[PDB]
């Protein structure tokens, strides 16, 4: 056994040799370890408390004596002193924890389990003694010095990262809770109590100073660059000389000071930068404001208002010319969408909220713009879209390239997605598809198939079921034409060539033709085809409208031969001219049974082309109001440069008539569909408030056509007069089925 006073002199000399680091040898280390070991194993029966008391007193005395050399120092000098003394103290205490390791494992561990909190591991005793003799009196000075060094580093200068990293490492390690040194993770109790709080409350002051000293004398365009640089720079000073847990708090505080405090100046510059379309700075501003959660809400409103206003200005620039030129209008809307879609996809990083604001902006724009207000109806926009879509697929002189045509039809479908009243587009496209398919005016059938498939992908199947039935009816009619040609070759033939395209009455929206006198050869051809038709499949009927059928006649009575193609009405009138030349309008009406208006327009076209003369050529030709007593005489001296000249060109007064007939038909279709929808709704509901009922109808039909409240009141009046949707007894609010 060895008493403490017999060994404490040598042990104290050795520990003082450790702290005043003079490059000790391992022999002295093992002599010191034997000195601790030979005392802790000698004979309230566990020796080692006295040695712990002398170690605590020695470390307290050493740190109190060390403090007197650093209390007067300030700024860089006290920080250098603290970091050098902390590194030396930490290393020499890590040595002392190995010297007094036996007391660290078999008395400190023994007396820390049995309560007795207040005695710690010798290393953790050295940190606690550091936390009470050289950290508390040098806390404010050192943290002020490192704050000033951070100020000098932020101001643009270069400063030592080693000193700051040493101070921050000391502040992190000093946070070791003494009561349970066997803790989990790194302890930051001291760190976020004397430095992180002070540094994080001083960075607020320094960035509010840079903000309202740079934003005052520089535009916001440069301030965004400076703010992005500062945010990256404080992402840098968490990994250089700070702790990794200050990253989130520091980035959040820098965002709240640089951005959130001055978000009121970003919005007033958002419109200015959007007007000049500086896409790079828009991307920089979105990348800056997006860090502020819930602050992006005002940017979407400004963006959608600007997109709507810019589109409205573009459509106003189109003016009256866009009404009669569908390509210009659709190209203007498409160009606005293309310009303000890259700005959302590239600058705004294709954000869901921003692309939703773009979609909502054009929805209020394509349906209701200057050209629609000029036509006092929102149906002019999908009608113009349908006209443009018909113009691309029409057989022009220059056929469009198939890849180019597919791309521009996809662009049209992109425009179509924002059309509110898709029903008007459906009806107009159906009629244009009819007028193209019955005349073989389609540029390419695969283009039509692709458009039908894209419409199918866009809006259900009932939207384009009629169109698909029309296309398959065209195919079936082609097969039937081939079969009738084979039958004509087999059976008795017709001198007149015959080529029909039989179409379903359910599809192909058309108008039933007026009464018509069938020519004798045409009567024979009609009877032959009906015989073949009954031979194939009999139990049905055919309407035989001659409004959209043509053919060419040989003018042998003329001075020169002609192969002039003419409509069936015009074919009958020319046959009547062949039978007798002198012929009156009243005779035309009573023999050909054609209605007077359409027959008058036919005669107007015939006089317009100078196909044959009237009873007086010197009278009005293109502006004559023909009367039943007007006589028309065959003119054999008609001259033209070509023989296959077309007289079946459309007349100017019928395009608008078909347009308004389409509007009436789609209005009746709207009425029928909303009647059926409200019937289903009241079948599933059986009682509902009036405004709730109209809201339910609007939400139920919103996927295909947004209804109008006066039309809803008209159809509900029709149904309440029809007892299908009758009123319940004595109520003005609700009713029952």
């Amino acid at each position: 056994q060895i008493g403490l006073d017999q060994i404490w002199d040598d042990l104290r000399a050795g520990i003082q040799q450790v702290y005043t680091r003079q490059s000790m040898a391992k022999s002295r280390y093992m002599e010191l370890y034997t000195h601790v070991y030979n005392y802790c194993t000698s004979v309230a029966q566990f020796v080692g408390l006295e040695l712990y008391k002398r170690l605590k007193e020695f470390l307290k005395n050493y740190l109190t004596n060390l403090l007197k050399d650093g209390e007067d120092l300030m700024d860089e000098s006290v920080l250098k002193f603290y970091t050098q003394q902390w590194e030396d103290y930490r290393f020499s205490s890590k040595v002392l924890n190995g010297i007094c390791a036996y007391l660290n494992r078999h008395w400190v561990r023994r007396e820390c389990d049995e309560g007795r909190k207040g005695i710690y591991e010798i290393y953790s005793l050295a940190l606690v003694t550091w936390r009470d003799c050289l950290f508390r009196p040098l806390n404010k000075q050192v943290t002020n010095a490192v704050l000033k060094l951070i100020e000098k580093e932020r101001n643009g200068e270069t400063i030592n990262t080693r000193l700051i990293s040493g101070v921050v490492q000391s502040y992190v390690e000093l946070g070791l809770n003494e009561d349970d040194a066997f803790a989990k993770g790194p302890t930051l109790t001291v760190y976020k109590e004397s430095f992180e709080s002070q540094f994080l409350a001083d960075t607020e002051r320094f960035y509010t100073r840079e903000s309202t000293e740079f934003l005052q004398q520089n535009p916001v365009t440069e301030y965004m660059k400076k703010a992005e640089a500062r945010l990256l720079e404080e992402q840098r000073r968490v990994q250089v000389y700070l702790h990794e847990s200050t990253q989130d708090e520091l980035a959040r505080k820098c965002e709240q000071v640089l951005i959130e405090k001055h978000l009121e100046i970003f919005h007033t510059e958002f419109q200015n930068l959007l007007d000049a379309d500086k896409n790079e700075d828009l991307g920089r501003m979105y990348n800056l404001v997006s860090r502020i959660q819930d602050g992006l809400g005002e940017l979407k409103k400004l963006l959608e208002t600007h997109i709507h206003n810019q589109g409205l200005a573009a459509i106003e620039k189109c003016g009256e010319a866009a009404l009669n030129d569908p390509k210009m209008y659709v190209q203007t809307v498409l160009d606005v969408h293309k310009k303000y879609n890259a700005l959302v996809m590239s600058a705004f990083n294709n954000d869901a909220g921003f692309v939703a604001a773009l979609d909502k902006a054009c929805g209020r724009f394509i349906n209701n713009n200057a050209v629609t207000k000029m036509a006092q109806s929102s149906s002019k926009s999908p009608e113009l879209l349908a006209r443009y879509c018909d113009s691309l697929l029409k057989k022009s002189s220059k056929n469009p390239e198939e890849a180019e045509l597919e791309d521009t039809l996809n662009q049209v479908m992109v425009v179509f997605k924002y059309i509110e009243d898709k029903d008007v587009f459906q009806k107009f496209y159906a009629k244009m598809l009819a007028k193209r398919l019955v005349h073989q005016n389609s540029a390419s059938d695969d283009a039509e198939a692709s458009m039908i498939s894209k419409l199918k992908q866009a809006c259900g199947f009932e939207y384009t079921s009629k169109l698909q039935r029309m296309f398959q009816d065209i195919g079936v009619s082609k097969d039937l034409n081939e079969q009738f040609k084979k039958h004509l070759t087999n059976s008795e033939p017709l001198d007149l060539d015959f080529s029909i395209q039989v179409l379903s009455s359910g599809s192909w929206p058309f108008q039933q033709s007026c009464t018509f006198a069938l020519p004798s050869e045409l009567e024979r051809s009609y009877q032959r085809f009906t015989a073949f038709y009954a031979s194939r499949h009999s139990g049905r009927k055919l309407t035989w409208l001659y409004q959209l059928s043509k053919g060419e006649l040989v003018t042998n009575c003329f001075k020169n031969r002609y192969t002039l193609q003419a409509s069936t009405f015009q074919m009958a009138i020319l046959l009547q001219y062949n039978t007798e030349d002198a012929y009156t309008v009243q005779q035309l009406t009573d023999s050909t049974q054609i209605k007077m208006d359409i027959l008058a327009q036919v005669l107007q076209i015939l006089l317009k082309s100078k196909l044959l003369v009237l009873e007086d050529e010197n009278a009005n030709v293109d502006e004559v109001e023909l009367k039943p007593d007007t006589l028309i005489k065959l003119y054999l001296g008609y001259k033209n440069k070509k023989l296959r000249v077309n007289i079946n060109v459309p007349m100017k007064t019928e395009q608008k008539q078909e347009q308004e007939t389409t509007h009436k038909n789609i209005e009746e279709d709207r009425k029928l569909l909303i009647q059926a929808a409200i019937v289903r709704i009241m079948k599933m509901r059986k009682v509902l408030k009036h405004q709730q009922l109209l809201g339910e109808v609007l939400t139920q039909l919103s996927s295909r056509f947004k209804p109008r409240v006066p039309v809803i009141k008209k159809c509900i009046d029709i149904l309440i007069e029809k007892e299908y949707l009758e009123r319940v007894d004595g109520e003005k609010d609700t009713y029952s089925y």
């Binding site: 029909i500 395209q501 179409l503 309407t543 053919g551 006649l553």
Partner: peptide, 16 residues
């Protein structure tokens, strides 16, 4: 003595 060579037509098939 007018003569017609080529003629096409369109008819509406209605189910009875």
């Amino acid at each position: 003595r007018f003569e017609v060579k080529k003629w096409n037509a369109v008819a509406l098939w209605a189910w009875d």
